[PDB]
Amino acid sequence: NPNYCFAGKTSSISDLKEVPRKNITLIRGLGHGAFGEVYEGQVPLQVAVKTLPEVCSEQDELDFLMEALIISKFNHQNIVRCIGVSLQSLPRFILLELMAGGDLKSFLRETRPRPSSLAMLDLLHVARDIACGCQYLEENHFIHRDIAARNCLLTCPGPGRVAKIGDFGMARDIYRMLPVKWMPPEAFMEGIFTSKTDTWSFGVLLWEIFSLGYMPYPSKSNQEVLEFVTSGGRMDPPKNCPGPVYRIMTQCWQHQPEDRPNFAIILERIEYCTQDPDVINTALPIE
Ligand SMILES: Cc1n[nH]cc1-c1cnc(N)c(O[C@H](C)c2cc(F)ccc2-n2nccn2)c1
């Protein structure tokens, strides 16, 4: 059985909480993300059920086990909880906290203001939530490598929503298709990853958030983005984006890793934005 170390402590599949398969009922599909299908389920505790296809390479199965160990070891309010696993029956399950708000990218898309609602403060709270998750990862020396709106989840649609990081598939692969639009130069050029990798990606997530769910670098392909960013190019501000928010982005995208803020600083600047009336009184565009 494969080992895993986080915050020092070592763990193995033996440490995962096995839930009796009989206690698990599937309700409906939620979609699949390359790894396999995910269902809403119950154990009554509401869960999202990540499944391993019974037809898979042993490498797929190892990846699956590792993902289980990674998420079970985190303990933070802005990282999705693992209720447990069911590995002793096929297909194998990983059981996650059900985030009723769905993923962040689709939420932003479906909830953007129209003549038929969202405010700057809602976007800032999401940004703060994920920054807090990233800060917890940073201080535990875990590099996520794929911070992006599609990998974040919301507890609910309404104002009290809490955003959390919900997928760790990229980190799992590296621990043992590239998200180039979320990657800093040293990452996609040299394959160098550090805490400052996630800072760059967070800047891109911020853009995704305040653009309300647009794809980064609109109209550019991966290679054009690679060349654009390598030559010092950066995204323009999203529509109606307050200058203080855009400036967090541009600081996250500093070419030198050492010139980019750590997450404690990012959280400070996000806080300041939420206090600033000229920021939060700015109306979002209505499509
Ligand atoms: C309800 C609901 N509607 N739409 C999504 C959910 C949902 C709630 N809670 C979860 N724990 C959850 O987890 C999966 C693994 C996930 C995690 C992530 F970060 C990004 C995407 C996905 N995803 N979306 C569909 C298939 N895979 C999904």
Swiss-Prot record:
Localization in the cell: Cell membrane
Active site per database record: D146
Tissues/organs with expression: Expressed in brain and CNS. Also expressed in the small intestine and testis, but not in normal lymphoid cells.
Effect of mutating M66R: In NBLST3; somatic mutation
Residues with the Phosphotyrosine modification: Y4, Y39, Y175
Binding locations of ATP: H32, K50, E97, L98, M99, D167
Every Protein kinase domain range: 24-279
Result, substituting F74I: In NBLST3; somatic mutation
Impact noted for substituting F142V: In NBLST3; somatic mutation
Record PTM: Phosphorylated at tyrosine residues by autocatalysis, which activates kinase activity. In cells not stimulated by a ligand, receptor protein tyrosine phosphatase beta and zeta complex (PTPRB/PTPRZ1) dephosphorylates ALK at the sites in ALK that are undergoing autophosphorylation through autoactivation. N-glycosylated.
Effect of F74V: In NBLST3; somatic mutation; constitutively activated; retained in the endoplasmic reticulum and Golgi compartments
Disease / disorder: A chromosomal aberration involving ALK is found in a form of non-Hodgkin lymphoma. Translocation t(2;5)(p23;q35) with NPM1. The resulting chimeric NPM1-ALK protein homodimerize and the kinase becomes constitutively activated. The constitutively active fusion proteins are responsible for 5-10% of non-Hodgkin lymphomas. A chromosomal aberration involving ALK is associated with inflammatory myofibroblastic tumors (IMTs). Translocation t(2;11)(p23;p15) with CARS; translocation t(2;4)(p23;q21) with SEC31A.
Family: Belongs to the protein kinase superfamily. Tyr protein kinase family. Insulin receptor subfamily.
UniProt remark on domains: The EGF-like region drives the cytokine specificity for ALKAL2. The heparin-binding region binds heparin glycosaminoglycan. Heparin-binding is required for ALKAL2-driven activation.
Function as written in the Swiss-Prot or TrEMBL entry: Neuronal receptor tyrosine kinase that is essentially and transiently expressed in specific regions of the central and peripheral nervous systems and plays an important role in the genesis and differentiation of the nervous system. Also acts as a key thinness protein involved in the resistance to weight gain: in hypothalamic neurons, controls energy expenditure acting as a negative regulator of white adipose tissue lipolysis and sympathetic tone to fine-tune energy homeostasis.
Complex and partners: Homodimer; homodimerizes following heparin- and ligand-binding. Interacts with CBL, IRS1, PIK3R1 and PLCG1. Interacts with FRS2 and SHC1. Interacts with PTN and MDK.
Name recorded for this polypeptide: ALK tyrosine kinase receptor
Species this protein is from: Homo sapiens
Gene from which this protein is expressed: ALK
Span covered, complete protein: 1093 to 1400 of 1620
